[PDB]
Design a protein around this ligand. Structure first.
Ligand SMILES: CCCCCCCCCC
Ligand SMILES: CCCCCCCCCC
Ligand SMILES: CCCCCCCC
Ligand SMILES: CCCCCCCC
Ligand SMILES: CCCCCC
Ligand SMILES: CCCCCC
Ligand SMILES: CCCCCC
Ligand SMILES: CCCCCC
Ligand SMILES: CCCCCC
Ligand SMILES: CCCCCC
Lengths: 489, 489
């Protein structure tokens, strides 16, 4: 029985529309050489992001609205058009939910629900609190150390974050009575959420097998005459990564402290809680077995590139195992809105960015940068290239397409302005990695951690812009000095 | 806090596995000319269906398990492989959720949730009970008459069923206290569910614009030298369709009666309820406006083939309107499991059938029938062709691909055995239409109505096999006589 409407934030519709309209009106006075469709899709993308920020019609609704408008203006069809030879020349909005990252994240959310249900997450949280609970900064450093250990085995960051780290964070934040979407989020939750995101960044940066973009950069460099290698990457990133490991947590604890900084009796507290919870149970045993097996498959995926191990089918496998095994009912899975909400909005944003690249925007930016910076010494050229490869990820969501589109061109530019090949390659790779510290759609982990509710998006973007300045500083300066020490240039 | 597992129907895993295994072992002794991959995918398809029937791991879980097994045995990848020229030679499991019918059905479920929320559905139910409540068979006949009126305007059956009919049925069944998944389903619910499905069949059969398969048959016939036309179809189907309209409801009321057959005071009851509900409200007004506008767009889709009117983007549009308007919160949409469950299992089944056609099974069946029936008179040939085009839909889910694959070959066969072109064409079209009375995945409407819970699947398949015999009898015999009266042959 319904009487009145639901409260909507019509105020938030002011900024987006305005922006879009403005850019639309600017269409005729566009930079030139740019397709009008591209500029219109760009305006729509910007307005959609502004809506995600201002938060009218939560991310799901505003992204749905953006996709709808994209459909109305004729910028994107619904059914994949064909070239009469079988090729797809324009993908539709429905050919957007067939994305791997989205379904992976969703199934990982489901697995985490199963964890929290069987009681395993609480156990792990009370354990890591027994051992690191004192000085919650210790908790942050434990999770970042865990992520760093895992980066060497699991080559899909989204997995480490949604299947391993995020459950830990949720369990701990539940044990400290820090529930999201409340003022009690700032107790300890947001600290761990943000630290986990940035630790995932560090892990991705330390190991060449931290994600697909790194392999893409490896392939492209080898295409331009320079062979990366697991040991080279590690030996070049070890130092800057440690410097970041030491600085980042400190600046975060100074800028975003958890209101609960000391639990001096956490040891006896956790021991009492573990004694009350009783011994380990059968469903907990089964869920642990499944989690370990899925971890094993995600690892095997790094050495054997096989469809049976795509890092998403593995999640489908683990969840159907939870179903056949009884620990998880299908009704429990059809619940857990987070999965489907992510599916929706992440897939839509990725599709919009794909249309942004297909219509010729990013290619024009590459060509413009190629044609603009001519008479400068290779150092300032490297500086500008890095800054651009950083602040361009605001127009991307994959992390892979960004490199696929802008690595080889930037590398060619640098090598043409005298810059040495190895330095340029590794710097641009580290930059393509640390892009993540911009947005909530940069990569999977950000989409997971910046929307769960522990962190408002405004704080996210601010702190991430700052930490991005810091990441650029560290990597550029120090990693350059270090790659000079060992003979990378 | 979890202690014990959830109760699973491990018994239901007996039949499927067994079946699959058997067929797998039969692989080497297959009919010949058939790809081994095809036979294995066929076994997996059959086992998945047997699981859907026996109902272990409800449809979602068993279909997930089937997709997983399909992935493990190397019959389907996860990411669309490419031909080095851009073409897709094998689609993956993730390129299965980009289906129009599934997302359409889901968004229609969402719209229906909004309806039931604002109180509009109850209003409509009490109205149609004031006017037809007596002799609930009257209710069945009102909904079938409604569907018949709509078939002329809305060329997507899934829409008529999930956006219009199914909400009516749910509202009425709620007003009579017939809740699904309970013994109180047989009060009036199942009767209306089944009658609505079969009325959708009749509407699809009466008008050439009842669905895409009819247009496909029109195109293919015109390809083989015979021009269908809206008036020809209607004048040839009017009589058999009326005979079915008169027989079907009767055999259903005799075979599946609603335990509540008379509400002699339904008029005063409904009037009292409408007076208590109060006047019409603002959100009800808005929801009605949106429903009417979506109906309008679905209609316009029949004359202008335009991406802005794909009959699914329209549903996205209506639901985002409900969101921006306040009648519907995104949390309400992320709920309503039915949508996502349908998405999952329908998309998976459609993908499996697509792999069944791609690997060369259906083509082999067509070739075999072409090479087998040679020395028979055109009448018995027509009979066999019709029976096959009926009992083949058990190996399909689209309704469109079935015709796209088996219409022109069957038509060529018939025309080669002497049969006249117009008769063969129209008969095979009517048969491709009435296929729906087999399964729960035949077309959208069946997937909607046979899984909501008002009807067990066993009863569904049984009664639909019977009514399929009856549909074949009616159409073949009587429609043949009628098309002979008017000069179709
Ligand atoms: C919160 C207001 C955000 C407006 C930013 C508009 C900047 C558009 C840059 C392209
Ligand atoms: C309920 C048992 C169902 C068994 C059906 C087996 C049919 C196989 C057809 C190929
Ligand atoms: C249950 C794990 C499946 C791994 C597939 C490997 C097949 C060669
Ligand atoms: C909602 C329908 C808009 C279609 C506009 C097409 C104008 C040529
Ligand atoms: C041009 C208007 C865009 C609105 C996107 C929410
Ligand atoms: C305020 C953030 C705007 C982002 C533009 C892409
Ligand atoms: C390029 C846009 C950067 C804005 C960061 C808040
Ligand atoms: C070969 C066995 C398949 C079982 C599918 C549920
Ligand atoms: C595919 C045919 C299986 C149906 C079982 C009744
Ligand atoms: C292929 C025919 C199956 C029928 C089961 C009712």
């Amino acid at each position: 029985a319904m009487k009145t409407l639901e409260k909507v934030n019509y105020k938030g519709f002011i900024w987006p529309l305005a922006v879009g309209i403005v850019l639309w009106l600017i269409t005729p006075w566009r930079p030139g050489g740019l397709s009008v469709q591209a500029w219109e899709m760009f305006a729509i993308f910007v307005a959609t992001i502004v809506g995600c920020i201002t938060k009218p019609l939560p991310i799901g609704g505003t992204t749905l609205l953006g996709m709808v408008v994209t459909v109305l203006v004729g910028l994107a069809p619904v059914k994949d058009v064909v070239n009469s030879k079988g090729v797809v020349i324009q993908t539709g909005i429905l050919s957007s939910f067939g994305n791997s990252a989205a379904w992976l994240i969703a199934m990982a959310f489901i697995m985490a629900h199963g964890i929290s249900k069987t009681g395993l997450g609480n156990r792990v949280a009370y354990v890591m609190i027994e051992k690191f609970g004192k000085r919650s900064i210790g908790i942050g450093y434990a999770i970042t150390g865990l992520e760093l250990m895992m980066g060497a085995l699991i080559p899909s960051n989204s997995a480490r974050t949604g299947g391993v780290t995020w459950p830990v964070v949720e369990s701990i934040s539940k044990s400290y009575d820090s529930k999201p979407n409340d003022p009690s989020r700032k107790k300890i939750g947001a600290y761990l959420d943000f630290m986990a995101f940035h630790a995932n960044i560090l892990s991705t940066a330390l190991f060449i097998t931290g994600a697909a973009p790194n392999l893409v950069a490896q392939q492209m460099a080898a295409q331009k005459g320079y062979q990366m290698s697991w040991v080279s990457w590690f030996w070049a990133a070890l130092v800057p990564v440690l410097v970041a490991t030491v600085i980042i947590p400190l600046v975060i604890y100074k800028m975003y402290p958890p209101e609960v900084k000391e639990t001096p009796n956490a040891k006896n507290w956790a021991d009492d809680k573990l004694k009350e919870m009783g011994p380990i149970s059968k469903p907990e045993k089964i869920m642990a077995t499944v989690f370990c097996l899925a971890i094993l498959l995600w690892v095997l995926s790094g050495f054997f590139k096989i469809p049976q191990l795509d890092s998403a089918f593995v999640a489908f496998l683990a969840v159907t195992l939870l179903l056949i095994t009884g620990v998880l009912s299908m009704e429990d899975a059809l619940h857990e809105t987070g999965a489907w909400n992510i599916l929706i909005w992440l897939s839509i944003l990725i599709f919009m960015a794909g249309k942004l690249i297909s219509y010729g925007f990013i290619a024009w930016f590459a060509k413009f940068i190629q044609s603009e910076v001519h008479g400068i010494n290779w150092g300032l050229v490297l500086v500008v290239l890095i800054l651009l490869m950083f602040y361009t990820h605001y127009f991307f969501a994959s992390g892979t397409a960004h490199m696929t589109a802008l690595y080889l061109p930037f590398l060619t530019v640098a090598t043409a302005m005298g810059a040495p090949l190895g330095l340029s390659a590794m710097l641009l790779a580290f930059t393509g990695v640390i892009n993540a510290s911009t947005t909530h759609y940069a990569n999977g982990p950000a989409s997971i951690l910046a929307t769960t509710g522990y962190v408002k998006q405004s704080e996210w973007w601010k702190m991430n812009f700052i930490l991005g300045l810091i990441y650029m500083v560290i990597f550029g300066i120090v990693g350059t000095i270090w790659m000079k020490i060992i003979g990378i240039w």
